[PDB]
Every structure is written in structure tokens, then in C-alpha cells.
């Protein structure tokens, strides 16, 4: 059982670190760039119409 | 002068410049139909009015205008409790007038009759979850933020009706010895939904304690913004002059955001992001100005606004700005609602910025602040622990977390689940709290003094 | 002067302005509401009227006040709660029976009940006087005088009338100065426009700290007075709490408290707590309140008062810098303040810029932090003052990456975070070593080293220990304890003792809130001496648990140094630390063997 | 005639349309003040003027105007060196003024005789992390892009003090034969910080050879936007007339953007990309046209512009246009700064277009550019290998990653760590590179040719 545990801990550790480094900050970078574009559309629309 | 034109909601009148601002005008139609409005703008031989009822059906040479000579005010009295009004302050009684003793202007008051004094006395909503974890205090505003995955009006009704059943429980405790009153404002409510609120007050006996001002979904956007201003002035009279604590319930703030966004703060002018004005803040702030502790020092107006989050969003302007002015919030969620939890209130994303410090001691025990630390902590740990149970099982699950797994369940099913017309006093609420913590030993309630814990466990 | 042309919402348009400055303060119609002329196109002016125009008619006259929007700063500022247009709120409470003002009614900016004792300076009949030179002084509290009356900037000449000593009123004149004819009459107060900052001979690079005496504040990322500082918030999750702490432990010559646009429960709280509190210099007469002058605007109160709030505070503060007083400037909050501007922008019908927040925003934020700092006052005496601005910010639109916050971190030299978990634990300020930095540290550690402390060596080592401690815990999770040994175990333990002694405070004692420069130096000296000698001892053969049990009495006595008196070895010097060094040497013998 | 109206710091004048573009106007106000302005617009019996002094305090029909008859042109001398100025060219030490020996336009380049012979001879700044990785030439523009909260100004100080202690050893190798002078422009820079830049110039020996222009953000916007152009005219005059290399340190680029943003809101312009001007290109481009070799090809203007990232993103318009118009960029990374590396020059995106067009021989190796390509490519690979180490763990990693892991660690504490009063030679940096790069077999080192590689690994 100890040997199977030995194997499984290595896999499971890889995964916690993998979600942490690659996924979460990719998700931050994307969400911000499209939020700022999206907001820009609503405000510029008003500005062109008002002018 | 006659009507020049109407372009959308906004009406152009060519009429002369001699009317003052806030001045009521009467639209005299040839159809036997008189409609009233308030000047949005008064200009040089033209005025722009938005009409309280309708916007179309007027002519440009068969509709003529007259100026009343009297600005937008509410006849304020204390005979207004037990009486049904609309969104101009006209009755929908089908009987006697409003009655006055003063005429008060509705704009956030002409004189501002409020002082700033820190809250010090508990206000109770008759539900354990709100009162223990995120307490309400005299002159403090904590909104209920709910979503369109909820029956948000129906929850809103439970808060409101259970209020003022609290007042005899507080009376034995000696926290309130002066009367309770309810001022209810419906903005953008349905005919059927409106009916439910009213019937719930009759049943409880809380009809006598409330005045209802009604704005219907089919009445103009300008009618809708007039509606809460009527309710707060009426509250301000009760509060200042006869020393009552008055709890004012404004549902739905979301409709209120909609009326402003649409016109009357976006008439032709440029609004901020997502079509919701940047001075939508300034408007919210008017409502908050007429709320608070008032001269007398047994008089205050305590406010529970209800805001319904469009899709549960945390990047939309509506909950965020409103949320800065108010001192915390109660967050409701969809998750509890599905499970069959009623009312489905979670206290983890929720915050009350000042818990013990806001409220008093004398009608609430001293243990309230301490107990809230333990209930909050366990509840947090408890969400995490359930997710862990699902994976690990119970053959390798942690002991601390095993008790917290069971704790998550009880916190929902008895402290958050209550009846429709079940009312519970604050003392009672505190006792239940300890019962849920009673399962843990002392060594897993280590964030509390042994003197308090030894008494309360 | 003018005739109202039009009223469109809260903006008022008035024609037939044939001369009117584009900052000019105006009273519109017969309601007489506050307004200021934002723009002018022709004879039609755009005026934003900052109170409601319900009852205002087209065809009413608008009378110019005859001067821009300015504030008078005189004696009697102290122990008074004000608006940003400056009206005494306590006065309103008296008359109307409310702390909020009635619209269409205003009251004199400074109290006129008050009469203050003027004693002549050193310029006498016919003496030449020049800018910022001290013409006299007036008591500003009973206990102490602090408002020295200088000759106004932009004046100079010979003093033709110098009134004799005695008590006079704010209304009544005392001095007339002749240059080009009688230039004008002078009073005990002087006016200075709110967006114009008061002047100095030159500004200096601050090297001088705050007198807060907050131990972690001083040692880890040193407090500066003459600095700019950004602190995160989210409202009542610690941020208002620290502003109230900062007021208490501080004992600056003046403190100016600015509520930019707060919740109004918080403003009430600031007013009540302060006169019950005690000054840490051991002064009397409503202690903290006596040294504090309060501009307290809730967000409900007019938008003019919100925008004017920071302005009024900086000009007042800057004048106190010219008086030779070291000022602590507390602002709460700039996120609210950016919002006051955005509101005004949409009403008027101008385009705001990035994130719906205006074009003018960035230049306005920027001017405000750069205005504050250490200077030598204008005039021949050259007294030293400082203005330190600590501004609170929260998320605005709910994103803390939006333009407001991000613009301000770039300008700042000082950052001290806030965290909800750390705030629950009673660590205030809620800082670690990466949620905080100070670039003022360099000059500051140099300043302190001169005074006597061995400060630069010890501070660097403080940062290192916290950084390491964090890092060894991660290893214990992923790698395991196989990478852990007792040398590392001592490292974790020193950091714990440093957190408890420095970071945790809440004012349990009076000696837990003022701790001198020399006392702070002494705490870090015990803990670093314990660290190096524990490590040596385990290398000549000892265990962590064995070290822990053995150090014991000393370990307990040094943690408890905050509860202990700081007058034990004199008045600033603590005797226990001096006796620690010797104990530690005898102790090291017990631990090794 | 009179001031017709005034909008922000632009003033609407009614005045006869005969004056030429950029001509100074003087408004005589009843306060005693005279304030100077530039016609921003001429129209049919009306103008729109930007006022220099002020932004307010301007009367309607009581204010009067007078014409200079003279276009806005900077009085430039070389007697302005060794003296400290404000942003509009006047001593703050209050001694004798700038004075002139020429007047040069800031509204268009005067001569515009820039480079027909590519800048190609090296400039050394005493830094390995700059000079190797990004090759600097006499007329080339490479900017430093940093993030909010960083000491952008401290790295700029390093550059100033070490440049000109290299130059006599560099004079021998060939890279100067002419006077060196600094033209320093601050927009939006702190008092303290400015005082640091003066100290830097004392250390170097070029406090006597520099002009300093100080504009604060508490000085009008209109002064702020003149400050870089004033800097450029000064810098090309020294460079032209007495054949001098002038290095321009222009801090901060976003502060300048900020001011453009306010006179866009105030104009009848609509703002394009992200609330900034739709003419944002024309602004930036005016600065960048002036840079390169000027007539006689022994004078030049070399630029290091300083940009702080307002939102900390490299998608934000400011860095994106700026980067396109300039030749490369130098990146500063926050993670480095915190660790206590100095200079924190992260070379993961830092590249300079002229790398084999900024070097020759007799002062640089031709191998110099080639060596850069190994260093940059390995750094990246290494950076990737560290990313995999963090996730997968060493045991999982293959042999190629391990080598590269190792390269990365050595690169940080030895290459990009050097002192702050420590000069380096280009030869010396390459010899340091060869040892560090020596951690791979010949199969893996293949971004340089086998001839050069066989000699040196």
C-alpha cells in the first residue's frame, strides 16, 4: 500500500502546483484585458453620440 | 403656453420662464384628463417636464398648461400609518385625504433634520441569522443583496412582516420603550407581488404599523423615483417629533437604479459604464442623507434597502457603489435556495463592519460579539470540509473537520431555516448559537475567554 | 451682477456675467445656494450649484461674493468639526438642531464667539516686515499657542499701524501695511484659496519620522513625516480602525483629520472618542481633540464639500508647515474622492476618460501628494515643518486594478497593506514584508543611526527573518521535514517572537502605544542576539525544544517589554534590555551545556 | 478684444483673426497680472488660446488682450548649462534668465536633418545588463519600461552617474571625441527625487554641463506639455552647434500623456484608445522624430525615455505605440526588485532592434551581437525550465531542463547583479557571458557559428 501511496503523492503534488502557476494567472491576465475593452465600448459609445 | 413637442420620455413645453423649479404644472387635455408633472428643467421660455403619468396622448395646440404655483411636497402626519398611498402621495384609499400638520419637501429635506451620532442600540429583524452574525443598529444601514435566482421579494416580505413583533420582546429587555413603525416603499412591484406584501402585514397585525406607498411597474420612471422620498419623509416625521424608532424597507433598489439609468439622470446627458450613471452615487447618497439618528435621542430611522443583483454579479456598478455607502451587506445565495433552505441566508461573504460596537448591551447580552467570532470561523472551515469529505471519505478525514462537516448542516437547517411567521427574540438567538457550538469541546473553541466560555457553552 | 438664464438639474446657467473669474464663488438666486463657476461661454456661465435648486426660479439675480472660493484659517480651528467649504457643524447643532447644514443658509467659517489673545511679535511701529515673518502669535487652545501670525504671502512693506497686545475678535482688524498706499487691512486669520498651496523658501528631503511610536511601524518599514503613503482598505475591515489608532498614538504639533466622503457613523466615532483619549506626550484639555482639527464630510453632505475637503486640508496643513509645525495629515478616502470628481463630470456634460473617471483626475491626485512633504517655511526665521499625507483607498468599481489605485502606487514611496485575517488577529497595521514597502527607509535608517542606534544592520536582518520563515514552511508542506532541522526551527521561532512583540498591538497599555526610537532599537537587539546564540548552541550540541525551555524567563521578560514601562532606565531608555545582554551570555552557557 | 468665455485652461477670446499661428497673446487682467498664451486655434474673429500661467481667475468683459507679434519659439543658449530651471525656461534660483542666441520652434522641427548614416558606434553606460543585451548607439532611442511602485528613477540615476566615467576609457576605444551633456526633463516628478538627480550630476561632473527642467503636476498642464519640447530644442542646439552627444532622460512618459488627456477633454476632440487622445500618435512622434545624428555627424541626440506603466500592462496603449516608434525596450520586473537584485533588469522580453547595426569593430566584437543571441535565447529556456520545476519537480524533469535551470540561477546573481557605482566594459561583459553560457554541450549551443563557438563556449 505504502508503495502505491508513494506514487500517488508525486502525482497529486504536481496538480496543486499546476493549477497554481499556469492556470490562475492566465485567467487573471485574460479577464482584465477583455474587461477593459468591454468597458471602453460602453463609454466611447456614449462619447461619440454626445459629441 | 402649449406643448411644443415630446421626444421620448422628455416633454418640451414652450411655456414661459416664470415657474420655479420643483414647481408642479397641470396638463390640461381636451380629453377630460388632467395629469401632473414636476419641472426637471426650467429654462428661458420653455420648460422640460416629465409627466408623472403617461407621456403620449397630448397635442401641441389642444393641450394647454397651467402652473399650480405649489412645489412638490408631501402632506406629513402620523395618521398616515394604516393607509395606502401611491407614488405622488395621492391616496389609493378611495376614502379621505392624506392629512397634513406640515408640508415637507421631498428632495432629501429642505433643512436636513439629522445629526451624526454613532449607533448604540440593537434593532432586530426576528431572524437569528441576520441579528447574531451581522446585527442591525439604530442609524446603521445594512442592505440585503439577493439575486434573480432567488424569490427576492418574497424573502423581502419575511424581514418586513416579522419586524415590529420584535418591539414587545425588546420591551421586556428594555431596549425599546418607545413605539415601532414601518414605512414601506414599493418600487417597480407587480400587482400580485404587491398583494402578497400587504396580506402578510394583515395577518401579522403589522398593517396598522405600516404605511405603504405604491409604485407599480406600469407607472412612469419619474413616478418611481418620487416613491421612496415620500416614505423617508413620513418616517422622519415619526422619528423626530414623536420619538419612534422607524424601520424603513425599500424594495426594490434595482428598479430604482433602472428608473434613473433610463432617464432623470440620463436625459440626454452621458452616463458612466454599462449605461448606469456615475452620479448614480450622488442620487443614492440623497436617500442615505435622510436616514440616521435624529434629534431626540430616542428617535432614529434605521434602513434596510433591498438590492437585487442582476445575475449575481460583482463587477456590475449597481451592488458596488451602493455597497460603498452602506455599512456592510447581507449576501443571499442561490445554492441554499435549491436545497430547500428558507430563507436562504449565508453569513460567510456577508459582513457587518461594526458588530458589538454598533449595537448595545442592556437588551442584548455581552456574549454576542464573542459568539459571532466562533460561529463565523466554524462556518468558513465547514464549507471547505464538506468538499474534502466528498473526496477523502471518512477513513482519513480530519477530526476537527468532521465536526465542522456536521456543523455546516445544522447552521443551515435550524439557524438559517425558520418559519414564515416564526419570530425569535435576540436572547433566544444567542442560546441556539451556543447549542450548535456545544458539540465541539473547549480546545476547538480557543478563541474565546475561559470565563465567558465556561458560562456559555 | 448676473440674471439666471436657465436651470437644468443641479447645473445653473446664468447670463449677463460681464466679469467673473472662472473660480469665483457665487450665491445663486434668492435661496442663496453655494455654487462656483465651472466654465463660461460668452456672458452665459455654467455654474455647478452643489445643493438643490428646488424653489429656484429663472429671472433671479446672482450676486458674486467678490473673491474666489477660499477658506480662512485662523485661531480656533482646533476642537471644531467642519465641512470642506468650512462651516462649523457644532454650531448648526446648536441653532437648527442638526449636524448637517440647512440649504440656502450658511454660517461664518470660523467661530465668532471665540476671542483670542494676541501678543506682538517683533516688528514694531515703522519696522519693515516681509513675507512669512512672524508679526505676532495667538493662543489656539488654552494650554498652548500654536497659531503664529505671519505676514501674508504676496505682501511686504512697512507697518503703519501695529495694534497693542490684548484679546481681539476675528472680525476686527489689528494691522495695516503700507506698500503702494494702504495695501489692505489684516486680521488674526488670513484667507488662502483652497487649490492654491501656501508657499515656502524651499522644500527639503524628509529624513524625519512620525511620532506615532508604533513599534513595527518604526522598525520594519520606517514611518516618515514629510512623506506620501497609500494604505488599502475595504471599509471597516480595519482601515478606519488604523486611522483612529494613528490619531491616538501620534502626538504631532497638529493633526488635520479629513473625511473625504465616509459613512458618517465613522465621522461621529472620530469626534466622540478623541476628547476621552489621552495624548502620548502627556498633555491635557480634551487631549487628542485639542490637537485635531476636523474636516468631516460624509458622502451624503454636498459634493462641493467633498471635493474641497482635501484641498482645504492641504492648504491648512501647508500653512502650519510655514508656522514651523509638523503636521500629520490623515485622509480617508481617495477612492471616494475620485468619485466626487466623476459625478461632477457626468452632470455637466463633459466627457470623463479612462474607466468612466475624468481626464483631470490624474493631475489632481498627483498634485495632492507632491504638495505634502518637509520644508522650511517662507521668511527670515526659517522654521522646519512637515506635512505627511496618509490616504486611504478601497476598490472602486470593485476592481483594485482600476485607474485610481494604480495611478497612486506609482507616486507613492510608502505602502502599508491591510488584510482581513491579520486584522482579526489584532495585528495593526496588517503588514508582513511583501504587502508593504518603504523607499523612504534609506534616508530614514541613516537618520536614526546618527542618533545613537545601531539601526541599519538590525532593520535589514528583521526583513530577512520574516522572508525566510515563510519560505521554510512551504518546504515543510511539499518537500517534508527532511529539509527541516533545528537551525531552521530556531528561524521560525525568532519570527514568532518578532510578530508578537512588534506587529501585535492594540493599545492594551499606555506603553504599548508610545515606545521611543531607543526602545524599538532595544527590542530588535534582544531578538537578534537570541537568534545567533541559539544557532551556535545547537551546533555545539543542543535541540530546539531544549533551547526553548532553557531560554524561558528571558524569552518571557522580553516579549512582555511592551507592557513594561519605557521610563525604567531614565525616561526613554529601558533598563531591562541593558541587563538582557549579560543574561544572554550566562544563558548561552546553560543552553549549550 | 476681450475674453468671450473660458473653458478649463483653454480661453475663448473674441479677437481679430489677423495674428499667425502659435503667436503669443497677453491677457491683461484687472488683478494686475499679465498671463501669456498661445493661439491653439484662430477662427473668424475668435480664438481658442491655451494660457501658460493659470487655469482660472479670468474675467469676462473686464480682461483685455495685446499681441506680441511673435510665434512661440524657445530662446535657446548654451549659457543655460550649469543652472536649474522650471518647465517653461526660467531660473528658480532667480538669477539671470535663460536668454537666447537663437529662437527654435517646438511647433515642428527646425532643420530636421536626422540620420542618413545609421547610428552604429557604441555607447557604454557601465552596465552589462543594459549594454550587452541591448546595444546603444549614438542617436538610437531605447526606453526603460517599468511598473508602478518601482524605483524607475533610481535605475535612471545609475545610468547617469556611471555614463561619463566610462567615456575616457571608451574615448581610447573610440566612442566619443566630443563634449557630453545631459538634458534632464521632469514631468510629474517628486521634489526629493529631483534633488537626487542633481546629486547624480555632481558625482559625474556634469552638473555644469546639464540643464534641468522641473514641472510639477501642481504647475499648469499647459506648462507640463511644453517641458519635453523645451528639453529637445535645448538638446539639439548643443548637439548641432558644437557637435555634442546629448543624452536625454525624459521621465515620465505617462505624466506627459496625462496632460494631453486633459486638453482633449477640454478640446472638441473625442478620446480614442482607452480614454487617451485619438491623436496620441502625433504627440509621441514629435518627440521621437528628434533623435538621431544631426548635421556634421559628430553631434547627436540619444534618448532614453522613461515610462511607468499606469495600469501595469503591456496592452495598455501608452507602452504599445511608444515601443513601436522606439527601437526596443528595456524591461524591469517587480519580482526582481523585491528580491533585492540591482539593477532588476529582467531580460525575458528586453531586446533592442539594432544589435548587428549598432556594433562594428575596434570597440565591440562583431561577436558581441552573436553572444547576445545565445544569452537571450538561454535565459528564456531557463525561465521556462524553472516554470516546469515549480510544477512537476526535479525528478520528473529531463536532462536538458536541468542544465537550463542552472543557467538561470547563475544569470540572476552574477550578470544582472553588479554595483551601483561600478562600471563595466563591453569586452568584460562578453567574457563574463562565455563562462556562464559554458554549461551546455556544443549540440545545444547553436545560436552562434561553429568558428566563434569552437574558440569559446
Curated annotation (Swiss-Prot), chain A:
The task this protein performs is described as: Subunit of the V1 complex of vacuolar(H+)-ATPase (V-ATPase), a multisubunit enzyme composed of a peripheral complex (V1) that hydrolyzes ATP and a membrane integral complex (V0) that translocates protons. V-ATPase is responsible for acidifying and maintaining the pH of intracellular compartments.
Q: Where in the cell is it found?
A: Vacuole membrane
Family affiliation:
Belongs to the V-ATPase D subunit family.
Q: How the protein assembles, per its UniProt entry?
A: V-ATPase is a heteromultimeric enzyme composed of a peripheral catalytic V1 complex (components A to H) attached to an integral membrane V0 proton pore complex (components: a, c, c', c'', d, e, f and VOA1). Interacts with RAV1 and RAV2 components of the RAVE complex, which are essential for the stability and assembly of V-ATPase.
Name the lineage: Eukaryota, Fungi, Dikarya, Ascomycota, Saccharomycotina
Query: What protein is this chain from?
Result: V-type proton ATPase subunit D
Further remarks about this protein from its record: Present with 8500 molecules/cell in log phase SD medium.
From Swiss-Prot, chains B, D:
- Membrane among keywords: yes
Could you tell me the membrane topology recorded for this protein? Peripheral membrane protein
| Record-linked CDD domains | ATP-synt_V_A-type_beta_C (cd18112), ATP-synt_V_A-type_beta_N (cd18118), V_A-ATPase_B (cd01135)
**One example of a Gene Ontology biological process annotation:** ATP metabolic process
Q: Where in the cell is it found?
A: Vacuole membrane
Instruction: Please give the GO cellular component terms listed in this UniProt entry.
Output: cytoplasm; cytoplasmic stress granule; fungal-type vacuole membrane; Golgi membrane; membrane raft; proton-transporting V-type ATPase complex; vacuolar proton-transporting V-type ATPase complex; vacuolar proton-transporting V-type ATPase, V1 domain
Principal place of residence: membrane
Give GO terms: molecular function aspect only. ATP binding; proton-transporting ATPase activity, rotational mechanism
Recorded hits in InterPro entries, A to Z, give: ATP-synt_VA_C (IPR055190), ATPase_a/bsu_AS (IPR020003), ATPase_F1/V1/A1_a/bsu_N (IPR004100), ATPase_F1/V1/A1_a/bsu_nucl-bd (IPR000194), ATPase_V1-cplx_bsu (IPR005723), P-loop_NTPase (IPR027417), V-ATPase_su_B/beta (IPR022879)
Q: Which residues cross the membrane?
A: none
Report the PROSITE patterns cross-referenced here: ATPASE_ALPHA_BETA
Q: Per UniProt, which keywords does this protein have?
A: ATP-binding, Hydrogen ion transport, Ion transport, Isopeptide bond, Membrane, Nucleotide-binding, Phosphoprotein, Transport, Ubl conjugation, Vacuole
What positions belong to coiled-coil segments? none
What SUPFAM superfamilies does the database record attribute to this sequence?
Answer: P-loop containing nucleoside triphosphate hydrolases
Could you tell me which residues carry Phosphoserine? 109
Provide the disulphide bond pattern: none
Q: Which residues does the record give as ATP binding sites?
A: 353
| Subunit composition and interactions | V-ATPase is a heteromultimeric enzyme composed of a peripheral catalytic V1 complex (components A to H) attached to an integral membrane V0 proton pore complex (components: a, c, c', c'', d, e, f and VOA1). Interacts with RAV1 and RAV2 components of the RAVE complex, which are essential for the stability and assembly of V-ATPase.
Q: Which family does it belong to?
A: Belongs to the ATPase alpha/beta chains family.
What is the stated purpose of this protein?
Non-catalytic subunit of the V1 complex of vacuolar(H+)-ATPase (V-ATPase), a multisubunit enzyme composed of a peripheral complex (V1) that hydrolyzes ATP and a membrane integral complex (V0) that translocates protons. V-ATPase is responsible for acidifying and maintaining the pH of intracellular compartments.
Please name the PANTHER family in this protein's record: V-TYPE PROTON ATPASE SUBUNIT B
The extra comment attached to this record reads:
Present with 131000 molecules/cell in log phase SD medium.
Full protein name: V-type proton ATPase subunit B
Its lineage reads: Eukaryota, Fungi, Dikarya, Ascomycota, Saccharomycotina
Amino acid at each position: 500500500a505504502f508503495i502505491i501511496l508513494d506514487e500517488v503523492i508525486k502525482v497529486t503534488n504536481r496538480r496543486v502546483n499546476a493549477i497554481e502557476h499556469v492556470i490562475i494567472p492566465r485567467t487573471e491576465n485574460t479577464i482584465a484585458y477583455i474587461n477593459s475593452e468591454l468597458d471602453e465600448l460602453d463609454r466611447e459609445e456614449f462619447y461619440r453620440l454626445k459629441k | 403656453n402649449t406643448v411644443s413637442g415630446v421626444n421620448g420620455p422628455l416633454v418640451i413645453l414652450e411655456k414661459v420662464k416664470f415657474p420655479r423649479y420643483n414647481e408642479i404644472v397641470n396638463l390640461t387635455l381636451p380629453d377630460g384628463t388632467v395629469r401632473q408633472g414636476q419641472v426637471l428643467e426650467i429654462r428661458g421660455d420653455r420648460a422640460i417636464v416629465q409627466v408623472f403619468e403617461g407621456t403620449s396622448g397630448i397635442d401641441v395646440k389642444k393641450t394647454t398648461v397651467e402652473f399650480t404655483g405649489e412645489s412638490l411636497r408631501i402632506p406629513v402626519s402620523e395618521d398616515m400609518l394604516g393607509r395606502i398611498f401611491d407614488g405622488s402621495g395621492r391616496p389609493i384609499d378611495n376614502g379621505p385625504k392624506v392629512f397634513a400638520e406640515d408640508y415637507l419637501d421631498i428632495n432629501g429635506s429642505p433643512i436636513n433634520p439629522y445629526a451624526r451620532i454613532y449607533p448604540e442600540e440593537m434593532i432586530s429583524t426576528g431572524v437569528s441569522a441576520i441579528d447574531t452574525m451581522n446585527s442591525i443598529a439604530r442609524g446603521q444601514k445594512i442592505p440585503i443583496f439577493s439575486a434573480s435566482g432567488l424569490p427576492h421579494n418574497e424573502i423581502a416580505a419575511q424581514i418586513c412582516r416579522q419586524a415590529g413583533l420584535v418591539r414587545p420582546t425588546k420591551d421586556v429587555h428594555d431596549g425599546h420603550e418607545e413605539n415601532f413603525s414601518i414605512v414601506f416603499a414599493a418600487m417597480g412591484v407587480n400587482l400580485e407581488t404587491a398583494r402578497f406584501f400587504k396580506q402578510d402585514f394583515e395577518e401579522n397585525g403589522s398593517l396598522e404599523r405600516t404605511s405603504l406607498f405604491l409604485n407599480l411597474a406600469n407607472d412612469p420612471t419619474i413616478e418611481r423615483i418620487i416613491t421612496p422620498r415620500l416614505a423617508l419623509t413620513t418616517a422622519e416625521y415619526l422619528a423626530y417629533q414623536t420619538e419612534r424608532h422607524v424601520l424603513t424597507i425599500l424594495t426594490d433598489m434595482s428598479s430604482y437604479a433602472d428608473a434613473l439609468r433610463e432617464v432623470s439622470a440620463a436625459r440626454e446627458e452621458v452616463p458612466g459604464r454599462r449605461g448606469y450613471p456615475g452620479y448614480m452615487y450622488t442620487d443614492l447618497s440623497t436617500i442615505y442623507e435622510r436616514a440616521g439618528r435624529v434629534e431626540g435621542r430616542n428617535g432614529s430611522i434605521t434602513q434596510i434597502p433591498i438590492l437585487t443583483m442582476p445575475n449575481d454579479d460583482i463587477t456590475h456598478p449597481i451592488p458596488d457603489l451602493t455597497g460603498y455607502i452602506t455599512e456592510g451587506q447581507i449576501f443571499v445565495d442561490r445554492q441554499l435556495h435549491n436545497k430547500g433552505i428558507y430563507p436562504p441566508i449565508n453569513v460567510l461573504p456577508s459582513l457587518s463592519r461594526l458588530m458589538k460596537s454598533a449595537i448595545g448591551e442592556g437588551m442584548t447580552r455581552k456574549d454576542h460579539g464573542d459568539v459571532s467570532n466562533q460561529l463565523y470561523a466554524k462556518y468558513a472551515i465547514g464549507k471547505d470540509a464538506a468538499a474534502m469529505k466528498a473526496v477523502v471519505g471518512e477513513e482519513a478525514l480530519s477530526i476537527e473537520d468532521k465536526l465542522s462537516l456536521e456543523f455546516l448542516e445544522k447552521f443551515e437547517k435550524t439557524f438559517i431555516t425558520q418559519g414564515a411567521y416564526e419570530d425569535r427574540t435576540v436572547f433566544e438567538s444567542l442560546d441556539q448559537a451556543w447549542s450548535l457550538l456545544r458539540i465541539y469541546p473547549k480546545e476547538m473553541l480557543n478563541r474565546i475567554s475561559p470565563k465567558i466560555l465556561d458560562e456559555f457553552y | 451682477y448676473g440674471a439666471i438664464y436657465s436651470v437644468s438639474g443641479p447645473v445653473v446657467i446664468a447670463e449677463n456675467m460681464i466679469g467673473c473669474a472662472m473660480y469665483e464663488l457665487v450665491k445663486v438666486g434668492h435661496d442663496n445656494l453655494v455654487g462656483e463657476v465651472i466654465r463660461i461661454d460668452g456672458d452665459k456661465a455654467t455654474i455647478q450649484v452643489y445643493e438643490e435648486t428646488a424653489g429656484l426660479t429663472v429671472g433671479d439675480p446672482v450676486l458674486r461674493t467678490g473673491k474666489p472660493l477660499s477658506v480662512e484659517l485662523g485661531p480656533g480651528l482646533m476642537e471644531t468639526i467642519y465641512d470642506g467649504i468650512q462651516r462649523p457643524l457644532k454650531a448648526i447643532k446648536e441653532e437648527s438642531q442638526s449636524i448637517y447644514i440647512p440649504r440656502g443658509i450658511d454660517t461664518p467659517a470660523l467661530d465668532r464667539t471665540i476671542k483670542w489673545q494676541f501678543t506682538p511679535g517683533k516688528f514694531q511701529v515703522g519696522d519693515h516686515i516681509s513675507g512669512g515673518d512672524i508679526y505676532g502669535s495667538v493662543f489656539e487652545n488654552s494650554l498652548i499657542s500654536s497659531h503664529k501670525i505671519l505676514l501674508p504671502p504676496r505682501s511686504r512693506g512697512t507697518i503703519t499701524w501695529i495694534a497693542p497686545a490684548g484679546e481681539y475678535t476675528l472680525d476686527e482688524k489689528i494691522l495695516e501695511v503700507e506698500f503702494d498706499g494702504k495695501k489692505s487691512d489684516f486680521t488674526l486669520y488670513h484667507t488662502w484659496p483652497v487649490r492654491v498651496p501656501r508657499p515656502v523658501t524651499e522644500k527639503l528631503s524628509a529624513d524625519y519620522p512620525l511620532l506615532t511610536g508604533q513599534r513595527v511601524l518604526d522598525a520594519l518599514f520606517p514611518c516618515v513625516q514629510g512623506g506620501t503613503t497609500c494604505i488599502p482598505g475595504a471599509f471597516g475591515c480595519g482601515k478606519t480602525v488604523i486611522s483612529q489608532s494613528l490619531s491616538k498614538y501620534s502626538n504631532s504639533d497638529a493633526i488635520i483629520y479629513v473625511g473625504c466622503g465616509e459613512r458618517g457613523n465613522e465621522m461621529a466615532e472620530v469626534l466622540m472618542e478623541f476628547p476621552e483619549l489621552y495624548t502620548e506626550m502627556s498633555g491635557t484639555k480634551e487631549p487628542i481633540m485639542k490637537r485635531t482639527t476636523l474636516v468631516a464630510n460624509t458622502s451624503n453632505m454636498p459634493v462641493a464639500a467633498r471635493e474641497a475637503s482635501i484641498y482645504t486640508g492641504i492648504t491648512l496643513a501647508e500653512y502650519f508647515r510655514d508656522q514651523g509645525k509638523n503636521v500629520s495629515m490623515i485622509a480617508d478616502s481617495s477612492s471616494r474622492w475620485a468619485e466626487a470628481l466623476r459625478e461632477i463630470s457626468g452632470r455637466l456634460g463633459e466627457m470623463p476618460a479612462d474607466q468612466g473617471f475624468p481626464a483631470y483626475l490624474g493631475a489632481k491626485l498627483a498634485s495632492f501628494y507632491e504638495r505634502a512633504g518637509k520644508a522650511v517655511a517662507l521668511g527670515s526665521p526659517d522654521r522646519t515643518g512637515s506635512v505627511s499625507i496618509v490616504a486611504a483607498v478601497s476598490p472602486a468599481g470593485g476592481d483594485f486594478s482600476d485607474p485610481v489605485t494604480t495611478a497612486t502606487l506609482g507616486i507613492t514611496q510608502v505602502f502599508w497593506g491591510l488584510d482581513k485575517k491579520l486584522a482579526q488577529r489584532k495585528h495593526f497595521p496588517s503588514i508582513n514584508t511583501s504587502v508593504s514597502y518603504s523607499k523612504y527607509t534609506n534616508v530614514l535608517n541613516k537618520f536614526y543611526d546618527s542618533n545613537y542606534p545601531e539601526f541599519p544592520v538590525l532593520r535589514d536582518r528583521m526583513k530577512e527573518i520574516l522572508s525566510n520563515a515563510e519560505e521554510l514552511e512551504q518546504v515543510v508542506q511539499l518537500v517534508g521535514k527532511s529539509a527541516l532541522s533545528d537551525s531552521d526551527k530556531i528561524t521560525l521561532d525568532v519570527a514568532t517572537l518578532i510578530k508578537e512583540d512588534f506587529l501585535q498591538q492594540n493599545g492594551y497599555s499606555t506603553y504599548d502605544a508610545f515606545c521611543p526610537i531607543w526602545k524599538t532599537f532595544d527590542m530588535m537587539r534582544a531578538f537578534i542576539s537570541y537568534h545567533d546564540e541559539a544557532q551556535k548552541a545547537v551546533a555545539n550540541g543542543a535541540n530546539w525544544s531544549k533551547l526553548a525551555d532553557s531560554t524561558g524567563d528571558v524569552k518571557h521578560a522580553v516579549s512582555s517589554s511592551k507592557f513594561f514601562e519605557p521610563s525604567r532606565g531614565e525616561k526613554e531608555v529601558h533598563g531591562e534590555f541593558e541587563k538582557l545582554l549579560s543574561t544572554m551570555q550566562e544563558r548561552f552557557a546553560e543552553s549549550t551545556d
